[PDB]
Symmetry: C4
Subunit: 328 residues, 4 copies
């Protein structure tokens, strides 16, 4: 069914029917960084080609006007530029001058004013377009989101008993020897609902408690961790039976944010579970082993889960039964 979030992070939403599009041209840098590579290269070449052509054109015009083309065959009458007759020669000179190569077969002289004022503008413009092009490139190459490709989440989550408390649990793990600095995790329930006055809301978001009160969510991630949300009176699962579970339609979205270690940027990873991944009455398998002063991880059992024994009642019923017993 429609998930609203794919199992890897991509979201299923189509922004359509926008009127004010000039906004895209106001922050041209972000639109430039968001495009694919096939287009970035195209724009790069086009800009560099247009800038070179325009300045070659200006050079050719400044030459023709001066009248150098009418005295190409003459020892005296020093011209503006040396060995510059054809249209191609000017293009070559412009390329050789802007990229800072300067072979030296065709050189500028000191008896042609306004050549200096053209060279100045060309040199400045070339230095301005270089940083803008190279900065865009670097920015696009070194973005942080790619790190989220190596932050493994877990399979279908589980619901089980723990110290007389019903809990919902899932697993998260890393995949490198570096560190995620200042990591943190949160989780939201998405499920349509209707108010008591008539209003209908397509999709409602509600936070789930994972340790935001006791500061227990700022996790220290080295080995695979198991996150667990306890079911209490404030949780949206306060009244859910083992048989009533498949009859509902909801979704759980989990988000993990942190900072890369090499650079200092922020990265984010997402995941979701719909209804067919909430397995009732199971446990995860241990993955840590101790060998000669080291701890070995398996990663072959990262998703493996086994079965156990668990009551089949809503936590509200569990409380009543307990309370009554205590009283009597």
């Amino acid at each position: 069914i429609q998930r609203y979030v794919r199992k890897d992070g991509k979201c299923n939403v189509h922004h359509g029917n926008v009127r004010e599009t000039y906004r895209y041209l106001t922050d041209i840098f972000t639109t430039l960084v968001d495009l694919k590579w096939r287009f970035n290269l195209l724009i790069f070449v086009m800009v560099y080609t247009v800038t070179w052509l325009f300045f070659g054109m200006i050079w050719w015009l400044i030459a023709y006007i001066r009248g150098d083309m009418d005295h190409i065959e003459d020892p005296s009458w020093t011209p503006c530029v040396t060995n510059l007759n054809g249209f191609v020669s000017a293009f070559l000179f412009s390329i050789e001058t802007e990229t800072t190569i300067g072979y030296g077969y065709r050189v500028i002289t000191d008896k042609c004013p306004e050549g200096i004022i053209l060279l100045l503008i060309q040199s400045v413009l070339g230095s301005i377009v270089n940083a803008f092009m190279v900065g865009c490139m670097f920015v696009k190459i070194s973005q942080p989101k790619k790190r989220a490709e190596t932050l493994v989440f877990s399979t279908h989550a589980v619901i089980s008993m723990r110290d007389g408390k019903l809990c919902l649990m899932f697993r998260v793990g890393d995949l490198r020897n570096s560190h995620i600095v200042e990591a943190s995790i949160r989780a939201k329930l998405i499920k349509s609902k209707q108010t008591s006055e008539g209003e209908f809301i397509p999709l409602n978001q509600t936070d789930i408690n994972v340790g935001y009160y006791t500061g227990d969510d700022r996790l220290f991630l080295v080995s695979p961790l198991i996150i667990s949300h306890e079911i209490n009176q404030q949780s949206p699962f306060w009244e859910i039976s083992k048989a009533q579970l498949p009859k509902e339609e909801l979704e759980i979205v989990v988000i993990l944010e942190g900072m890369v270690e090499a650079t200092g940027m922020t990265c984010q990873a997402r995941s979701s579970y719909i209804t067919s991944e909430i397995l009732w009455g199971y446990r995860f398998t241990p993955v840590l082993t101790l060998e000669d002063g080291f701890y070995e991880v398996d990663y072959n059992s990262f998703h493996e889960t086994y079965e156990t024994s668990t009551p089949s009642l809503s936590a509200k019923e569990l409380a009543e039964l307990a309370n009554r017993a205590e009283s009597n």
Copy 2:
């Protein structure tokens, strides 16, 4: 009337009558980045032109003193620099040397000491001014605040009933396929007040509760969201009637902060509502539709709002009426 915040973000304040102005010259980089473009280009050219002129001047002087100008017509007596007689020639040589072009029609020799010690200084100075100029440029081009141009807020907000609770609501939406990482929202009331001892305060700021206690304000922004503040005993709207609303003079300022996804910088967007946008007894229109495994947004109804039925009493009165009823 005076809003103290324009409907798009600009603030109406004039900082005047400052004495210690040298502070502006202590952090010259920020003042350089804050200026417009028309001036940045001017400064760029002026600096580059002055640096080139000064070094050309030094070259011309070092030459004249040596006495090369007195033996321009002589095969022997190797000079300091080749083909360097006029003042223009030195300027050309300085340009060609600092920007790293080096045509080769005029070259340095190896029988003129102190030429090396001048070339060293020139090369270092040129490399120091290049990074400072290019870094300023890049910094100014790639700033994050421009992203705030594509973060749409909503029109006049609404006040309506919800599950027997009076609530104040407004709407926020995105405009791209990227993500705002670690987003968050807050809101402040601005309204003049007089203490109980005589002191008068021009403008007072007071926070409004939007979910700071339960961690419900760290929103996950994909589709247009509706933010809602519940009116309870702690809210500054505890005693406000439908007829008494237009008789007051206040303002609500809303702020949203986050991190761009491409880079790792922070961006902020603001908005305000004065008194003529607090519409009593209305609702927003749904904007989500489901089509063939995708969710389509409209954005043509983003501002559209319709009317409904709602009591006309202050929440304090609503409580009393309820309490009394329950009792009896």
Copy 3:
């Protein structure tokens, strides 16, 4: 007296008698950025001068060995490099080759192997030292802390009554048209104390409540603000009389942190008050004026304060008197 913090931010502490100094050479970049300018320039020149000399030396040796110096006067017998006889010539060639100038009066040939393998190493080394030198420079030029030079604090703070509550107040203001993103403020009391078992502590730090509970400290800074800490049962001023104030010895340190708007870095400003700035029974003067759709700030009255009437008793006494009255 010894303040432990100067009125502008500098701290009076001397780190002495360190044994393991090699730590400074482990993070050589921070030590490089922390030095003054006079030394940075020196290191820059020395590195560039040593790198050029070493490679010129290698070139001169590779030439002498080949035996080119023994056939300087010969048309045939193509040498390794052209016009390279003296020691100075090699230095010039190395400079011209590493900085990417390439005049062309002395050129490499294609009949001298190992010249390519030297040019490769030279080109790579030069490109590696260039980014390291230019990056250090840029980093040092564009640091954020300089912004703290334009974040004005206030003069001696005040203590006064407000709605039957004793409060301690001071003032903070900006000095630009930009914005401080995600600003926040905190304050600590520093005062020596002796436990009840014998231990003596030189200087003790204790936080002061300024709005950390209700999220009221995340301020929105446009015009000069007045920060106010209410004196309640949990404040270290619970028992302090008007006459007993000058008899104590304490200090208050205030800290404000935020993010610059142009870049995305973090900046911090500090200030302190000792005992002679806590003025009892005063108020600040308004600074805002309204003129033709704008709000004008004065900044000539930013420090001006006037006098008023206030009881002279500790807040504990104020409570007792009130309680007793209410009872009777």
Copy 4:
């Protein structure tokens, strides 16, 4: 014994048996930055050498085909490139063209089409590989984690009485004249445990209270500080006797995070204590001295600790004894 964290920060964990390895090739930048230097230099040279060879090859082919090698000895018949006959000549020309040197002994002409379209591609490719190589280098040189080398922690921590409260204390200090902006500290207990249903957990993490509730953990670090966790009913040390301490097996991990001052990146330092560093009944030695308007630190007594008198009972027993006494 196995510590799970070394006394300096390195962690003892071996990630093994991974199946999907292509993930490493999806975020090639992080893998490039994570390697050692010995390999980075190797990759740098290999890339630069391959790029130069390929383009030299293309040049040699474009020349041979044109038929220039068959008319090397002819005054007329202008060729494509000048003085380009052997395979080495093309390599030299490619090097001289891509690195922007341009000696000028061998030059391009204006009667050989497709030379421009080759030069364009070469120039663009060279500018794209330059920023990618130099950016990687700079990124690797200027990383923040190195600062953690100069953030001294303390030796074995202590447990002692303070105002009738049992507390656990340790020490932290800096080592420079700069500042750590927005510092903060946290601490976790690691110790295996078995639930009440059969499940066994290898290593369990549980937060320890250090001031997260009153905002007292956001420390202002100038001189050596002493962090102290009070033992109350909610602490995992609620039932631990002086004799029962060595009989347990646990570990305490301490983490400190902040922002460097020069740049704006985030740094993190870690440390651990196992069981043999929890010394019962001791105190630290003062390290501050006052001299002529300055505060001198010693750093020779940073680890020195002395002995004192303290009861030997669990805090639970201390409470009972007190309660009983009060009652009677």
